[PDB]
Amino acid sequence: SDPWK
Amino acid sequence: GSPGIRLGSSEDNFARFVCKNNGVLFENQLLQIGLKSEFRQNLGRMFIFYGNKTSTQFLNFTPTLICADDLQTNLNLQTKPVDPTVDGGAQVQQVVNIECISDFTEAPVLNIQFRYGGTFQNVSVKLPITLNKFFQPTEMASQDFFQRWKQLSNPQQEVQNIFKAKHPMDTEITKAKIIGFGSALLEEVDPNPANFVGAGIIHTKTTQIGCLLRLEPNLQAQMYRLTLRTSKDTVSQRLCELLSEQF
C-alpha cells in the first residue's frame, strides 16, 4: 500500500 | 552557524541566495553588492556587481575571493581583476568562473577593500555558492523513482530532519523553492499529493551524486519532515541542512 516503506 | 545577532554580519543575506541566483547580497551606505549567477554541470559563472552609492569616486577598489581550507580543494574559482577606480554612482562588475571539484559545505568569503574620502573601507561577506547549485534535475516516472529510492543500502546515505517551519507553509512558494533549489519537482510520486518529491544529480569533477528527496509538510503542527537519500553521505547531510533552512 504505502510504497514509502 | 555563528552565535550572535546576524545584522551587519558577513552573512545577513546568504540564505536568500540558496534557491535563487539573482539579487542584492549586501548593502551598506557606500556600496551595494549584487549578484547574478548561472550554473551548468559542475560549473558556474557568477557576476558580482559593485555599485558606488555615493557622489565620490572610490580608489584602489580591490575585491578578493578567499576559500577556507577544505574549500581550497573542493571549489576552484577563477576571476579577472576589476578596475580599481569606481566613479560615484557607477558600477563595476566582476565575473567569477566556478568549478566544483567535490561536494562541499563551506562558503567562499568575498573581501572588499577600497579608499573613500581618504579612509580605509573594508567589507567581508560570505558568497552564496552552495552545493545544490550544481544540480541536474532528473525527471522520471514514479515507478522508476521508487526503484531508485529502495536501492539505498548504506544508512549514512539517508538523512532525515523534522523541523519547525520558519516561514508560512505556502504551497506555490514551496514549489518554487524546490525548483530553485535545483532538483526536478515530481508530483505524482508520493501517493499523498500534499507532499513534495525531488530528484536530481549533483555534479562535481570527481563524482556524480544521485539525489532523491521527500518533503512532508504538517500544516497543523507548522512542521516538516524532510528525507534525503543520495549516493554520498556528506551530500545527503549538506543538502538536508541547506534545504531545511529554506522552510
DSSP labels for B93-149? EEEEEEEE-S------EEEEEEEETTEEEEEEEE----GGGGEEE----HHHHHHHH
Q: State the smallest CA–CA distance between residue B157 and chain A in angstroms.
A: 16
Any idea which residue has 535563487 for its cell? B20
CB B246 within 8 A of CB B181: yes
User: Which residue in A2, A4, A5 has the most chain B C-beta atoms within 10 A of its own C-beta, making it the best mutation to test that interface?
Assistant: A4
- Homologous superfamily of the B135-247 domain (CATH): TATA-Binding Protein (3.30.310.10)
For CA atoms B128, B107, B129, B138, the dihedral sign is negative
Chain B residues in contact with A2 by the CB 8 A cut-off are 191
Parse chain B into domains and list their residue ranges: 1-134, 135-247
Question: Regarding the domain delimited by B1-134, which CATH topology (the fold level of the hierarchy) does it fall under?
Answer: Immunoglobulin-like (2.60.40)
Report DSSP letters for B28-93, one per residue.
-SSEEEEEEEEEETTEEEEEEEEEE-SSS-BEEEEEEEE--TTHHHHEEEEE----S-B-TT-EEE
CB B244 within 8 A of CB B178: no
Rounded distance between C-alpha atoms, residue B194 and residue B186, angstroms: 12
Kind of pairing, strands B109-116 and B135-137?
Answer: unpaired
Backbone phi, psi, residue B195, to 5°: -85, 170
State whether residue B151 sits within 8 Å of chain A by CB.
Answer: no
Cβ distance of A2 and B191 shorter than 8 Å? yes
Which residues does residue B115 pair with via DSSP β-bridges, in sequence order? B59, B120
Backbone phi, psi, residue B114, to 5°: -165, 170
Nominal resolution in Å?
Answer: 2.0
Q: Both ends of chain B: CA-CA distance in Å?
A: 17
Q: State the smallest CA–CA distance between residue B35 and chain A in angstroms.
A: 40
Which residues does residue B39 pair with via DSSP β-bridges, in sequence order? B44
